């Protein structure tokens, strides 16, 4: 079961100090993916961390498209999240594809 | 009911909104927003500012 979802980093770094924005975005992506996959363990590919940190600590990209693959099951169920580049986030919405 | 026009903007001002400035040249200039007001008070040309009905009338878009 693979989920393709957008997360608005600008909304998740809101209310927090701008210096603590890129690490705060990483923590937010991890929590959001937990409430999408319904898992407890989230691994993020370094590609996600290169995208989030692309514009520096203060400015995070406005939106991230992420591919969550629920690799791991049988009492482990980790989630592997990869960045999927998209020209624009137009009518993009969560797309749960496939089954275990 | 009665409506006025941003003197700089040329966009209509509904009653109760906007400010009026009376100049030493004895002309009241009714301004719809604090934008209309600061554009005028910085000598910004009405034409050159695209949203104003004056620059649209020069480009013929309005007329």
């Amino acid at each position: 079961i693979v989920y393709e979802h957008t997360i608005r980093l600008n909304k998740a770094v809101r209310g927090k100090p701008s210096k603590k924005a890129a690490p705060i975005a990483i923590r937010a992506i991890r929590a959001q993916v937990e409430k999408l996959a319904k898992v407890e363990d989230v691994r993020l590919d370094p590609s996600v961390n290169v995208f989030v940190w692309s514009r520096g600590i203060r400015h995070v990209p406005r939106r991230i498209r992420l591919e969550v693959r629920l690799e791991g099951d049988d009492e482990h169920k980790f989630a592997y999240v990869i960045n999927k580049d998209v020209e624009n986030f137009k009518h993009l919405t969560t797309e749960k594809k496939g089954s275990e | 009911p009665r409506i006025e026009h941003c003197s700089f903007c040329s966009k209509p001002v509904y009653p109760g909104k906007g400010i009026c400035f009376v100049r030493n040249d004895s002309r009241v200039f009714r301004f719809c927003t604090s934008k209309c007001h600061r554009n005028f008070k910085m000598k910004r040309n009405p034409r050159k500012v695209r949203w104003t009905k004056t620059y649209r009338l020069l480009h013929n878009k309005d007329m």
Binding site: - | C20, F21, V22, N24, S26, V28
Partner: protein, 133 residues
């Protein structure tokens, strides 16, 4: 002054030097105080358009007027004030016209636009002013 005034934002506190609209030969009037002001502790007396202010003519003014506390009326103010009709109005410069304690003006002419609140309060200001705005 005639009638009941309506509270309008009082732009000029004491110390406010205001330009002189009348041709009496004063150029800038220094506001010593506001007529009719019972004030709280620490509150500088403040005056709006249509309020009589004791002023002193500055060094630039003709000597005869200078060195006497004299009454005046604020006729224009930079501070935006709301009329009870929702018109927020402001003027390019704060100004005053020197008037006797009775109501008569020391200067024959009032220069530039004059506010309605001053014009209603003082009949002589209304007749003299070319424009009431």
């Amino acid at each position: 002054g005639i009638g009941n005034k309506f509270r309008i934002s009082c732009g000029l506190p004491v110390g406010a030097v205001i330009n002189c609209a009348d041709n009496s030969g004063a150029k800038s009037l220094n506001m010593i105080a506001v007529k009719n002001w019972k004030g709280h502790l620490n509150r500088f007396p403040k005056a709006s358009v249509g309020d009589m202010v004791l002023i002193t003519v500055g060094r630039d003014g003709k000597p005869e007027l200078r060195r006497k506390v004299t009454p005046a009326v604020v006729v224009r103010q930079r501070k935006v004030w709301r009329r009870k009709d929702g018109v927020w109005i402001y003027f390019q410069d704060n100004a005053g016209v020197i008037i006797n304690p009775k109501g008569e003006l020391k200067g024959s002419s009032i220069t530039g636009p004059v506010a309605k609140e001053a014009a209603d309060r003082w009949p002589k200001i209304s007749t003299t002013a070319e424009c009431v705005h």
